[PDB]
């Protein structure tokens, strides 16, 4: 008794990383909302030096 309008299933079919997912593209993930990726916990690895005894 009313016009059909899209629901969550429709929206989620439109909300993936890409249209037409494959194995690789399903392994892909959509980008972050503010385009800022979380920082990577890289190791600074300061040089260690023996200053002495000689």
């Amino acid at each position: 008794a009313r016009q059909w309008q899209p629901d969550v299933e429709w929206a989620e079919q439109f909300g993936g990383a890409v249209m037409y997912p494959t194995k690789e593209t399903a392994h892909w993930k959509p980008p972050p909302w503010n385009d800022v990726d979380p920082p990577k916990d890289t190791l600074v690895s300061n040089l260690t030096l023996n200053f002495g005894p000689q």
Partner: protein
Amino acid sequence: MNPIIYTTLIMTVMSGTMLVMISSHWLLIWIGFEMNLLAMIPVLMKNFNPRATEAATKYFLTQATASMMLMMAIIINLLYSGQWTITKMFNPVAMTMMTMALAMKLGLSPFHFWVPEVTQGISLQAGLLLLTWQKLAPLSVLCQISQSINPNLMLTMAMLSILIGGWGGLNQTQLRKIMAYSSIAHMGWMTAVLPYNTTMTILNLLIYITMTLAMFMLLIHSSATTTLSLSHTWNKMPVITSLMMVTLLSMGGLPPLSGFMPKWMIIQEMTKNESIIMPTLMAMTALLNLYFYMRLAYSSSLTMFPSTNNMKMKWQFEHTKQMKLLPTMIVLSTLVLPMTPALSSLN
């Protein structure tokens, strides 16, 4: 970035492009390209994040390679003629190098990957400037040297651009990558007509720039970068979605909208030169672009997607910043078909 530094970098980008456009010396044209790239990198990196850094790195690598190939072509031409003036090139090898370098700068296929990657990397304002201005310069150089362009190479790259743009846009669901693939296809159309009528190239450039400015400014106004983000705009400002839908229809080339004028004029001009297969294939391939424009139009205006609960607060508040010339871009990109014979003024 300081506002003064930002505006001086924008002016430096524009100055490099203007030097390219007004110079009569190949060295000065190369200097203009270099100045444009140098001032353009920080604009891409304006909002610091790893994606922006990666996009700026890829753009720098591609543009540096293209500039190196361009200078090699210039030097090879000087070797065989002793001429520094930009006219018909006197060596076919130098002309091929120049065509490859300018195509790599423009993003014509098979030199297109950096276009979607960089555009997705950078913000909406940076993508707007990138597409518009950075297409504006190399096309002027190509128009200057058009009389020596190899038709086979140019038309091959143009058809590749149209096909690749259509297919990539079909797959994409991010708005910036959609815009990038649309840009690749439109560059294909312009360079396809290039070896026959630089006037038609300029007409297509102007119409494309108008439609792209309107589209990018609508995205900036609505703060939408994905399909689902743009699906919430009907519940905040339904006018913007309607204008965007009309602009998308215009971009797809439907009559009687302004996007039909360049395709029409280019098909006519190529037919005058006894080209039929190429215009027919080009016209049929644009249906892919129209398909993904229509897919975008279904989500945003012709259907009402679910919204959220904080949209009520968004209703309570009002948009502050005013886009400059957005109504004019909307009108020029949709309603100037009856003004077609002004391309003679453009001549």
